[PDB]
Design a protein around this ligand. Structure first.
Ligand code: ZN
Length: 257
């Protein structure tokens, strides 16, 4: 099945998921000089005060921190978005080395990692229906660079030993995703896709300009996870990123001058 190896990685996905070569695939390179300021975008509204985290799961390609999405508790609105989008999970993509790991790039620069906060449009009732719509999802993407530790990440890092291998989960209640956000909500936005199979073209991407800093020790713990299940040959979960895809007939808009 699909993965991030030589024989099953991004360059192979199109065989099972032909939409991999589609018109609105993600990630993309953000060419900061060609993005255009769009004065009519609104400020984003990230309303995470009532968020209810439930669980953390190693799904074999990343780890997901899952939320209760059965009410409007942690929602994204505004910006480019019409309506209300509920947080369902967040996860990261990261590298084997500090010089790669992000999915989006900025003027071809790769960050050490990228956080994706995944939200679905409440007008479609559930996640599974939302991913079949062109405006079904809103993903907030946040770059990670290595430097100072991110205090609000530490609780995530410290549970990773309990979910080392594929299929393991752990209770993960009372985690506050506000502690993963940078100071500024300045962003770029464009229409795109899921970055993992099935690669559905259902996402309004909102990529923050300001990275967060995490420590070497924090990213090193990400790199101790495994792609494999327990009792299978160990393969470190690193380099779980899809590279930049062609922009095609899209324009990236900026919320800021
Ligand atoms: Zn992702």
């Amino acid at each position: 099945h699909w993965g991030y190896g030589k024989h099953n990685g991004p360059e192979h996905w199109h065989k099972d998921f032909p939409i991999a070569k589609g018109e609105r695939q993600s990630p993309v390179d953000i060419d900061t000089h060609t993005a255009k300021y769009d004065p009519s975008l609104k400020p984003l509204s990230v309303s995470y005060d009532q968020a209810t985290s439930l669980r953390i799961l190693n799904n074999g390609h990343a780890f997901n921190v899952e939320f209760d999405d059965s009410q409007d508790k942690a929602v994204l609105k505004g910006g480019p978005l019409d309506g209300t989008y509920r947080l369902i999970q967040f996860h990261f993509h990261w590298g084997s080395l500090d010089g790669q790991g992000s999915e989006h790039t900025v003027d071809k620069k790769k960050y050490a990692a990228e956080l994706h906060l995944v939200h679905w449009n409440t007008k479609y009732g559930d996640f599974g229906k939302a991913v079949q719509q062109p405006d079904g999802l809103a993903v907030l993407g946040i770059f990670l660079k290595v430097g100072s530790a991110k205090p609000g990440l530490q609780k995530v890092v410290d549970v990773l030993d309990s979910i080392k291998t594929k299929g393991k989960s752990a209770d993960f209640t009372n985690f506050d995703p506000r502690g993963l956000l940078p100071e500024s909500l300045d962003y770029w936005t464009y229409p795109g896709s899921l970055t993992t199979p099935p690669l559905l073209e259902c996402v309004t991407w909102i990529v923050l300009k300001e990275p967060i800093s995490v420590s070497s020790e924090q990213v090193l713990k990400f790199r101790k996870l495994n792609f494999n299940g327990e009792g299978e040959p160990e393969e470190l979960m690193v380099d779980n990123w899809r590279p930049a895809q062609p922009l095609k007939n899209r324009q990236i808009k900026a919320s800021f001058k």
